[PDB]
Amino acid sequence: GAELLSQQWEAGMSLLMALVVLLIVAGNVLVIAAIGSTQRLQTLTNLFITSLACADLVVGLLVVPFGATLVVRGTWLWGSFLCELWTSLDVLCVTASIETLCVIAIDRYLAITSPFRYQSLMTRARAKVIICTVWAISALVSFLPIMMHWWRDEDPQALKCYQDPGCCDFVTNRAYAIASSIISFYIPLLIMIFVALRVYREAKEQSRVMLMREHKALKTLGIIMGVFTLCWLPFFLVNIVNVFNRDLVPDWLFVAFNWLGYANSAMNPIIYCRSPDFRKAFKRLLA
Ligand SMILES: COc1ccccc1OCCNC[C@H](O)COc1cccc2[nH]c3ccccc3c12
Ligand code: NA
């Protein structure tokens, strides 16, 4: 009865979760194998795309599976330490993603306003240093505050969760909710939007078939940026609203918005099918 409902729901939800995991992983392996085996896809810009695929891969392999076992079994099975590690990895991947999108926007702005300065300034070795720098900064603002417990609240319902090994709710104090949201998300979001609008203005101020092909590619990048925003902004708006008033937004919708964020990790591989070169490498690799 209660037990039959539980069996039906657990089995259906395990299946949906396996699908999501599979889509995230297969799609981002494909992006990475495509770029890694197609000389024509090995541009500097695509080094940043690979990094973005690595963040989404880590969400497919680690973040979503743990989150799935929690949603399905209705308890955390893995101990306190893995709860904190899982949370740190979650925060890391969102931070690395939006910082990397920001870099991509800046790379394109430079290329479109100073193609020659771009040429002498930007090399493989420098792109790699930029990628490492993004992951370094992202790890810094993710792991250390979570591992030093700067996020913990003193409310008794929070302390209840922190003491129960089967609770892995990321219940935070307000200061951390604000500061961490601004540092990991809002600041790079704003930078990315400001730069992406400038790139649009510059594109509008611009042989003909080659200019077309570039503009198709710029719009692809513009779409991954806009869809990332659409997928995560609702979550981070509710995160701030909750600080000021917990009743304005029902909890089920806050949770749904987190899952929409996770869903973003399956979207870029599909969006890259707008490109002939990606489409051809995908077809070939699936052989
Ligand atoms: C809504 O909770 C969940 C329910 C079921 C399964 C997984 C769930 O996710 C719990 C962890 N999700 C974290 C979110 O997936 C990512 O949240 C963040 C990413 C980057 C910086 C951040 N700064 C912050 C301050 C407060 C809350 C979140 C963040 C945060
Ligand atoms: Na706990």
From Swiss-Prot:
Alphabetic keyword roster: Cell membrane, Disulfide bond, Endosome, G-protein coupled receptor, Glycoprotein, Lipoprotein, Membrane, Palmitate, Phosphoprotein, Receptor, Transducer, Transmembrane, Transmembrane helix
Residues holding cyanopindolol: 90, 180, 258
Record keyword Metal-binding present: no
Location, primary (coarse class): membrane
Tree of life domain: Eukaryota
Transmembrane segments: 8-36, 46-72, 85-106, 125-148, 175-200, 215-244, 250-272
Membrane-topology annotation of the record: Multi-pass membrane protein
Biological processes, Gene Ontology terms: adenylate cyclase-activating adrenergic receptor signaling pathway; norepinephrine-epinephrine-mediated vasodilation involved in regulation of systemic arterial blood pressure; positive regulation of heart contraction; positive regulation of MAPK cascade; regulation of circadian sleep/wake cycle, sleep
Residue ranges, Cytoplasmic side: 37-45, 107-124
Keyword Nucleotide-binding set for record: no
Cysteines joined through disulfide linkages: 83-168, 161-167
Lipid anchor positions (S-palmitoyl cysteine): 287
Post-translational modification: Homologous desensitization of the receptor is mediated by its phosphorylation by beta-adrenergic receptor kinase.
GO molecular function: beta1-adrenergic receptor activity; identical protein binding
Location(s), subcellular: Cell membrane; Early endosome
One GO location term (cellular component): plasma membrane
Extracellular side: 73-84, 149-174, 245-249
Family: Belongs to the G-protein coupled receptor 1 family. Adrenergic receptor subfamily. ADRB1 sub-subfamily.
Function: Beta-adrenergic receptors mediate the catecholamine-induced activation of adenylate cyclase through the action of G proteins. This receptor binds epinephrine and norepinephrine with approximately equal affinity. In dorsal pons neurons, involved in the regulation of sleep/wake behaviors.
Protein name per the record: Beta-1 adrenergic receptor
Species, as recorded: Meleagris gallopavo
Gene giving rise to this polypeptide: ADRB1
Stretch of the intact protein here: 33 to 358 of 483
